[PDB]
Design brief:
TIM Barrel; Aldo/ket_reductase_CS; aldose reductase (NADPH) activity; 10 helices; 10 strands; 8-stranded parallel barrel; binds NADP nicotinamide-adenine-dinucleotide phosphate; binds 4-[[4-(3-hydroxyphenyl)phenyl]amino]-1,2-benzoxazol-3-ol; AKR; alpha/beta
Length: 310
């Protein structure tokens, strides 16, 4: 089950999220990425930021070498971190991710965030960079064959239009990877992306990992929502599967992180059932503009995506 991107390539609609906090041994990323592939995951989402591209690439390479899959079956994503937005730093950063993962190309390279940072990953000191020049450098990475497709992450409508209306544009972003779940369903952004043939990719679709460093512990726990729990009972599934199936039926490609073997195998059950129209309407009604990731300290950045929240 894949969706056709605006550049002709195909993206599996269910992806495996590989981020785990530093307290989790790096060995786990190798272990679970293999478990994900064995369970049926073909879309693997990583990033320079996650400090796991070595282990994630090892897992993909091992499952190719053991005959389980071919490289063409795997959709691997990495992301350009914000300290490498200056156009001369874009390609070296991609080559470095390819070297670490021992891959010849990524299937998808994304701008991780529009909020450019001073050329340490977290120096916070900002950098003024016209993202159109960053995008031009990304386009050259696709022309060189290092990235099959290119896209963006954490862009708002205004920032997408800055790219879509760039003079001399060669490649539209194939996708915009943003926070998306029933408490923050991005309906307006989703309609906009659909109208421009851009795929919205959902992260934190299961409510986020609720890390005390980024997430307010008092924020509501998505997977304990009464509506998702009732719907989980009706369909004999789980709240997680309801939240994942919700995204698929509204045209969103959805990521799901799990470092637990049983839940990794569970999340591929999203293709085994359907939600009713009334089920989807009830989930729609949970929307409350709730971002689990508190970026309020970065609200001063000229490219802060959540501007005009009030
Ligand atoms: N571009 C960006 O800025 C950005 C930001 C955030 C995330 N992402 C990407 O999106 C991925 C997913 O988002 P996320 O990391 O916030 O996590 P998530 O997908 O919202 O999942 C949150 C938690 O759900 C739990 N879970 C998974 N399946 C479950 C199930 N069937 N039943 C119950 N609990 C379940 C997992 O815990 P267990 O591991 O214990 O199962 C996991 O820690 C990330 O790993 C990353 O690849 C990108
Ligand atoms: O230019 C800037 C400026 C300010 C903040 C940021 C910034 C952008 C994305 C992230 N991401 C994540 C955070 C926590 C858990 C995660 O799991 N997966 C992820 O991607 C992720 C963190 C910081 C970029």
């Amino acid at each position: 089950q894949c969706v056709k991107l605006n550049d002709g390539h195909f993206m599996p609609v269910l992806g495996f999220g590989t981020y785990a906090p530093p307290e989790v041994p790096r060995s786990k990323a190798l272990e679970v990425t293999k478990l994900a592939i064995e369970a049926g995951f073909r879309h693997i989402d990583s990033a320079h930021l996650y400090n796991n591209e070595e282990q994630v690439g090892l897992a993909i390479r091992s499952k190719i070498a053991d005959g389980s899959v071919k490289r063409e079956d795997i959709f691997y994503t990495s992301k350009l971190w914000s300290t490498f937005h200056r156009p001369e730093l874009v390609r070296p950063a991609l080559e470095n991710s390819l070297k670490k993962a021992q891959l010849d190309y990524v299937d998808l390279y994304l701008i991780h965030s529009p909020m450019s940072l001073k050329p340490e990953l977290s120096p916070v000191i900002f950098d003024i960079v016209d993202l159109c020049t960053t995008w031009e450098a990304m386009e050259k990475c696709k022309d060189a064959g290092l990235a099959k497709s290119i896209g963006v992450s954490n862009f708002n409508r205004r920032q997408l239009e800055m790219i879509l209306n760039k003079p001399g544009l060669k490649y539209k972003p194939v996708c915009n990877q943003v926070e998306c779940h029933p408490y923050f369903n991005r309906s307006k952004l989703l309609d906009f992306c659909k109208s421009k043939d851009i795929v919205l990719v959902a992260y934190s679709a299961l409510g986020s990992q609720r890390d005390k460093r980024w997430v307010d512990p008092n924020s509501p726990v998505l997977l304990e929502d009464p509506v998702l729990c009732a719907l989980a009972k009706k369909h004999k599934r789980t709240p997680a599967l309801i939240a994942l199936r919700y995204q698929l039926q509204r045209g969103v490609v959805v990521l799901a992180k799990s470092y637990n073997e049983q839940r990794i195998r569970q999340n591929v059950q999203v293709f085994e059932f359907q939600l009713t129209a009334e089920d989807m309407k009830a989930i729609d009604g949970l929307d409350r503009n709730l971002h689990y990731f508190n970026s309020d300290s970065f609200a001063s950045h000229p490219n802060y995506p959540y501007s005009d929240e009030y």
